[PDB]
Design a protein around this ligand. Structure first.
Ligand SMILES: N#Cc1nc(Cc2ccccc2)oc1N
Length: 123
């Protein structure tokens, strides 16, 4: 059961998403971009992603691992870097700060999960 629990990441990710939604820096990234308020968005971005979509995908049980969730979160930030490439932009700075916060906190979730996997595979 509790040591090396291969399902513990789910609640840990739910908690991290709660922290992210609290952050003022997540405001531009909470919901899908409105494709009529920004009609050139899809000209630039192939695969839109936002934190409400990540949170619903997790709730629906559609991530097989925390690495899958992490891929979608990283897409939020890589899409922002493509759409708002200027380091002058306060939106660029927001994305950088929130990315760094996410990467700090996801680190232990991933390493713990992979350790659990290695242990169960070995035994
Ligand atoms: N001002 C401003 C601005 N407004 C957008 C739209 C946006 C923002 C965040 C994520 C996705 C899309 O980019 C900018 N640089």
């Amino acid at each position: 059961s509790m040591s090396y629990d291969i399902q513990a990441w789910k609640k840990q990710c739910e908690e991290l998403l709660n922290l992210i939604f609290q952050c003022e820096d997540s405001e531009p990234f909470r919901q899908p971009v409105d494709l009529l308020e920004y009609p050139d968005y899809r000209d630039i971005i192939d695969t839109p992603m936002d934190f409400a979509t990540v949170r619903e995908t997790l709730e629906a049980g559609n991530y097989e691992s925390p690495m899958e969730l992490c891929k979608d979160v990283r897409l939020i930030f890589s899409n922002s870097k493509a759409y708002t490439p200027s380091k002058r932009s306060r939106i660029y700075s927001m994305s950088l700060r929130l990315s760094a916060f996410f990467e700090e906190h996801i680190s232990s979730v991933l390493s713990d999960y992979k350790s659990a996997l290695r242990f169960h595979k070995r035994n």
